[PDB]
Amino acid sequence: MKRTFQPSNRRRARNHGFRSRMSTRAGRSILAARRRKGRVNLSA
Amino acid sequence: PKPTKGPRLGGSPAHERIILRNLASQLFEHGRVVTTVTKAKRVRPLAEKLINRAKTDTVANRRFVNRTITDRGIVHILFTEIGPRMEGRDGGYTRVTRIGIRKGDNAPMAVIEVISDKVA
Amino acid sequence: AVPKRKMSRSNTRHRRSQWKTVATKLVTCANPACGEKHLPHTACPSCGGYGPRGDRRQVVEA
Amino acid sequence: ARVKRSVNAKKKRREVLDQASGYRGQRSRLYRKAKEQTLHSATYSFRDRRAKKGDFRSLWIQRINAASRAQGMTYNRFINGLKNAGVEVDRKMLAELAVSDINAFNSLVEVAKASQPQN
Amino acid sequence: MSKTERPSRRAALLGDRPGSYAIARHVRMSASKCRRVINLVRGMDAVDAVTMLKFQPQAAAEPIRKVIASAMANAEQTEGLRADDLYISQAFVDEGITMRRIRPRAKGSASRILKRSAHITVVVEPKEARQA
RNA sequence: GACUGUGUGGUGGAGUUGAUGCGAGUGAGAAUGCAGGCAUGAGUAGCGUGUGACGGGUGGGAAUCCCGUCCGCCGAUUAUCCAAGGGUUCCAGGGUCAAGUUUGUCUGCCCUGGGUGAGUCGGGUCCUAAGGCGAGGCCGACAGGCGUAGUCGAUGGGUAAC
RNA sequence: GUCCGAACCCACUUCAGUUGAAAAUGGAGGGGAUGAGUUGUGGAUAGGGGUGAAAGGCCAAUCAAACACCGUGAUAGCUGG
RNA sequence: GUACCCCGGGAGGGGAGUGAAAGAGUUCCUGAAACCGGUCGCAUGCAAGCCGUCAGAGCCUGUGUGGUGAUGGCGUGCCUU
Ligand SMILES: [Mg+2]
Ligand SMILES: [Mg+2]
Ligand SMILES: [Mg+2]
Ligand SMILES: [Mg+2]
Ligand SMILES: [Mg+2]
Ligand SMILES: [Mg+2]
Ligand SMILES: [Mg+2]
Ligand SMILES: [Mg+2]
Ligand SMILES: [Mg+2]
Ligand SMILES: [Mg+2]
Ligand SMILES: [Mg+2]
Ligand SMILES: [Mg+2]
Ligand SMILES: [Mg+2]
Ligand SMILES: [Mg+2]
Ligand SMILES: [Mg+2]
Ligand SMILES: [Mg+2]
Ligand SMILES: [Mg+2]
Ligand SMILES: [Mg+2]
Ligand SMILES: [Mg+2]
Ligand SMILES: [Mg+2]
Ligand SMILES: [Mg+2]
Ligand SMILES: [Mg+2]
Ligand SMILES: [Mg+2]
Ligand SMILES: [Mg+2]
Ligand SMILES: [Mg+2]
Ligand SMILES: [Mg+2]
Ligand SMILES: [Mg+2]
Ligand SMILES: [Mg+2]
Ligand SMILES: [Mg+2]
Ligand SMILES: [Mg+2]
Ligand SMILES: [Mg+2]
Ligand SMILES: [Mg+2]
Ligand SMILES: [Mg+2]
Ligand SMILES: [Mg+2]
Ligand SMILES: [Mg+2]
Ligand SMILES: [Mg+2]
Ligand SMILES: [Mg+2]
Ligand SMILES: [Mg+2]
Ligand SMILES: [Mg+2]
Ligand SMILES: [Mg+2]
Ligand SMILES: [Mg+2]
Ligand SMILES: [Mg+2]
Ligand SMILES: [Zn+2]
């Protein structure tokens, strides 16, 4: 059947990309928190 | 000849019909065939009927044999080489010999061959 | 259904010991020049032959 | 001061599994099953140590009865006669006589017979 | 400790008796399926055993046969014994490393698959030791 | 009694005994307890729609690899080519621990090396839709909301090869 | 917003499946099939909120108030140890 | 960090070598229990068994103590609640 994950790289980058996170203070704090934890991937 | 009572070869009676025809044709083409015990023992009667028909050489007989077989090289072999070989033989044109088992599935194998020596 | 209890070692071994085979019997080749074991009513693997000592025939070229 | 339990813990397990060293199945292999069975074994053995007295007395009484009935006396009359005669040999030694020294037992039967009320 | 004769496989399987042995370790076959053939082969004459295992339909007959042959070869090299006067004195199968695997079942479930192994040990001796 | 010998071995290979005090992460059989390992069911159920047969080869080993011949099957698709998505799976050679619901000498697996070439094809370098962002600005305790001038944004317009 | 009927969309009945081939399907039929049709690409609405030809339906496989983290080791006159 | 030789396609093993030690051989210190087996002793195919306990022959062993144990009596698990 049709499943929940239908991949689109354009939509993924628009939704979770670095610039989307930088666009708002919540996303900037998410990037700061992922830096604090030490993730090698800060965003999509 | 006689039907086979139990479940047929190949998962369907049509496929067994085809398998037995092909196996008899291959036995006539090569003279001997390694074909597992049950297939050899099941194709012995049909092949013997075909050889008995091929013993007498007429156009109607060749057409009737060509109903089976359907390969005219095999019909030529059967009416030119195998058929004349059994002029004095009243039946028993083939023999089956057990050969061992297959490694992959333990299937008991056998060799069915057409009798190679003249009766006389 | 589903097993109600763990089967005891005695009963498990009672049933499991009956999962067994038999040894293959084997017969000596009637050919004097082969003398190797083969299955009864089966052509010899070593010489490819069949029949009694008097009237041998070749079944496999192996 | 973090302590590891194994060194102290295995002692009672070894003890219990040694006490269960003839049991059938899980009772001789697993500490929990062996512990349950040793609880039952201790209860049984304490009870049977007390019941042994009655069991052996019953056996002695049966043997004394059998040996005194061959002399035409019932066990109750034999015991009453030995009580009246004053011979305080207990049923253990009376049964030992009845098996090993039957002539001494028969003489004791005569002693008991002569000491009956006869009334 | 400071005692002589450190334990060895030969001292436990033979113990100064003439003969030899072989072990095939980590045979990628279950111990029970190997035992189904080892029970047939135990106590038999070694040459009869290898010829019979040449015809045994089971898949475990090919590993065990090799082990027997190796044992025979060892006895032909450290003891001077011939292959035709050897008999399989002892034979056993122990368990090896069992790999864990996952087979996906229905409804998002995964069932466990155990890939078992076996160590096969065969000890051969001269036929004169059968009654001694 | 919890337990224990300063008896006596085996294994082991670097710590630890007794007296008296001091401090505890100090004792487990159970919490549909947590982690690991291993049983029972059991050599049991299943091995995911189906048509294969034979001849020869390779090889330690072949129903399951390669070649050939018969036969069968799909054919508005079991064909061919793209988008999205994947990312080297592609090709050649070597391999058979693991993976492949069996075997495997085989492989979309492993290892080594190689392979993708545009003025014109699809995108950018051109254009805008929805929508987004948005100099100033207006609104809002703060945080922020909206929006002008603009600037992006194809799923469309334009643009030269067979 | 005609009729019969493929592709396509749906899901009425039945059988099977129920540790499935499948965390909703398969076989056989069945409804719509030029329309209030269906579908690709991108986009907008976000949790006491969205959206709803309205079933408390749907909002990433359990929605009469999603999910994640935090208050937090919530509290439980209850069960268990 | 196992030269060399033997069986094997390999894996593995057997000889040998290094090492104080290889049953320290790379799954490598020690190497418990569950669990899986080979061997030996006893018992076991007329028997109703919470699997024990007491009484008790016989056999093996006798390292004059230990293993098993026919047969008789008694005997309805553990925890929580
Ligand atoms: Mg019929
Ligand atoms: Mg079938
Ligand atoms: Mg038909
Ligand atoms: Mg039963
Ligand atoms: Mg009393
Ligand atoms: Mg799934
Ligand atoms: Mg102290
Ligand atoms: Mg504690
Ligand atoms: Mg515990
Ligand atoms: Mg537990
Ligand atoms: Mg099992
Ligand atoms: Mg079976
Ligand atoms: Mg069953
Ligand atoms: Mg069955
Ligand atoms: Mg089955
Ligand atoms: Mg082909
Ligand atoms: Mg067709
Ligand atoms: Mg690419
Ligand atoms: Mg590569
Ligand atoms: Mg890859
Ligand atoms: Mg490739
Ligand atoms: Mg390749
Ligand atoms: Mg495989
Ligand atoms: Mg290959
Ligand atoms: Mg615009
Ligand atoms: Mg501004
Ligand atoms: Mg643009
Ligand atoms: Mg475009
Ligand atoms: Mg209409
Ligand atoms: Mg209509
Ligand atoms: Mg609907
Ligand atoms: Mg969006
Ligand atoms: Mg309602
Ligand atoms: Mg949902
Ligand atoms: Mg709710
Ligand atoms: Mg609420
Ligand atoms: Mg609070
Ligand atoms: Mg060296
Ligand atoms: Mg050691
Ligand atoms: Mg170790
Ligand atoms: Mg009896
Ligand atoms: Mg009764
Ligand atoms: Zn022969």
From TrEMBL, chain A:
One of its GO terms (cellular component) is ribosome. It comes from the Bacteria. Signal peptide: none annotated. GO terms for biological process: translation. Keywords: Ribonucleoprotein, Ribosomal protein. PROSITE patterns: RIBOSOMAL_L34. Residues 1-19, 33-44 have a biased composition (Basic residues). InterPro entries: Ribosomal_bL34, Ribosomal_bL34_CS. One of its GO terms (molecular function) is structural constituent of ribosome. Residues 1-44 are annotated as: Disordered. Transmembrane segments: none annotated. The keyword Ribosomal protein applies. Belongs to the bacterial ribosomal protein bL34 family. NCBIfam families: rpmH_bact. This is Large ribosomal subunit protein bL34. It comes from Cutibacterium acnes. The lineage of its organism: Bacteria, Bacillati, Actinomycetota, Actinomycetes, Propionibacteriales.
From TrEMBL, chain C:
It comes from Cutibacterium acnes (Propionibacterium acnes). Pfam families: Ribosomal_L32p. InterPro entries: Ribosomal_bL32 (IPR002677), Ribosomal_bL32_bact (IPR044957), Ribosomal_zn-bd (IPR011332). Belongs to the bacterial ribosomal protein bL32 family. Signal peptide: none annotated. This is Large ribosomal subunit protein bL32. Zn(2+) binds at C29, C34, C44, C47. One of its GO terms (cellular component) is large ribosomal subunit. The gene is rpmF. One of its GO terms (molecular function) is structural constituent of ribosome. GO terms for biological process: translation. Keywords: Metal-binding, Ribonucleoprotein, Ribosomal protein, Zinc.
From TrEMBL, chain D:
GO terms for cellular component: ribonucleoprotein complex; ribosome. Residues 1-22 are annotated as: Disordered. One of its GO terms (molecular function) is structural constituent of ribosome. CDD domains: Ribosomal_L20. The keyword Ribonucleoprotein applies. Residues 1-14 have a biased composition (Basic residues). Keywords: Ribonucleoprotein, Ribosomal protein, RNA-binding, rRNA-binding. GO terms for biological process: ribosomal large subunit assembly; translation. It holds the Pfam family Ribosomal_L20. Binds directly to 23S ribosomal RNA and is necessary for the in vitro assembly process of the 50S ribosomal subunit. It is not involved in the protein synthesizing functions of that subunit. Belongs to the bacterial ribosomal protein bL20 family. This is Large ribosomal subunit protein bL20. It comes from Cutibacterium acnes. The gene is rplT.
UniProtKB/TrEMBL annotation, chain E:
It comes from Cutibacterium acnes. Keywords: Ribonucleoprotein, Ribosomal protein, RNA-binding, rRNA-binding. This is Large ribosomal subunit protein uL22. Part of the 50S ribosomal subunit. Gene3D superfamilies: Ribosomal protein L22/L17. PROSITE patterns: RIBOSOMAL_L22. GO terms for biological process: translation. One of its GO terms (molecular function) is rRNA binding. This protein binds specifically to 23S rRNA; its binding is stimulated by other ribosomal proteins, e.g. L4, L17, and L20. It is important during the early stages of 50S assembly. It makes multiple contacts with different domains of the 23S rRNA in the assembled 50S subunit and ribosome. It comes from the Bacteria. It holds the Pfam family Ribosomal_L22. GO terms for cellular component: cytosolic large ribosomal subunit. Belongs to the universal ribosomal protein uL22 family. Coiled coil: none annotated. The keyword Ribosomal protein applies.
